[PDB]
Amino acid sequence: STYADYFSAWDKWEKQALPGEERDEAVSRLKECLINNSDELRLDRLNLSSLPDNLPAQITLLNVSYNQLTNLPELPVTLKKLYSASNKLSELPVLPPALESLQVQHNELENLPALPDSLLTMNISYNEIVSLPSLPQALKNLRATRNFLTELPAFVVREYFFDRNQISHIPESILNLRNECSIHISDNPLSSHALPALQRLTSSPDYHGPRIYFSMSD
């Protein structure tokens, strides 16, 4: 993509802003990013209902969080960090294949794409996701609070957050993780027997297992 092609597309896209939508500021930042050959592009908090089709191809970080986006365009294959929290995305595109960080909490996602093996940290909280695909081996931090998962995924200081889902069963697989792992499973429709049982299990002096957080603090 040439400079003319970038600027052309952007300028065209700016002219169609709704009232209050700051496409003007977005185009200034996009131009600044290309002129300086910046690694980072931040279009956060611009009331954007869409992005232009062609983002600067060199970027390694894209932050479009806090907008009103319903789709993302195709993402630079160079991308390492994608922050697009607090939008209205109904799906994600295929993820840049060396992505390290994925922050998409507070959208309307119903499914996720394949997760690159490079992924270290992902926050998919506050969506409507019902199942998870294969998790990356490199994954250190998974925040998935307030989705609609019905089962834990089967499985480094790791932390998994699955609070406020639709999980009904504590699998034996959980009891096999190490003390370095923390699993948060509060406020799920577990058996009422789960709390007392877990409270005794994890409170014993001899308990070897993951740190499990499972009560409203009860």
Give me the domains of the chain, ranges plus CATH numbers: 1-218 (3.80.10.10)
Cα distances from 212 to residues 118, 139, 156, 164, 183, in angstroms, run 26, 18, 17, 14, 5
Rounded CA-CA distance 214/162 in Å is 10
The two structure tokens encoding residue 114: 């394949």
Distance of CA 118 to the CA centre of its chain: 14
Q: Are 143 and 124 in contact (CB under 8 A)?
A: yes
At 5, give phi and psi (nearest 5°).
Answer: -65, -50
Q: What angle do CA 115, 86, 90 make, to 5 degrees?
A: 55
Q: What is the largest CA-CA distance in the chain?
A: 68
Give the determination technique. Answer: X-ray
Rounded CA-CA distance 73/68 in Å is 14
Rounded CA-CA distance 7/101 in Å is 28
Breaks in the chain listed by the residue before each, with C–N > 2.5 Å: 155
At 160, give phi and psi (nearest 5°).
Answer: -115, 130
Resolution (A): 1.8
The three-class DSSP label of residue 24 is: helix
- Residue showing tokens 């209050």: 20
Alpha-helical segments (H) within 44-120: none
Burial class for 62, CB neighbours closer than 10 Å (0-12, 13-18, 19+): buried
Rounded CA-CA distance 64/44 in Å is 5
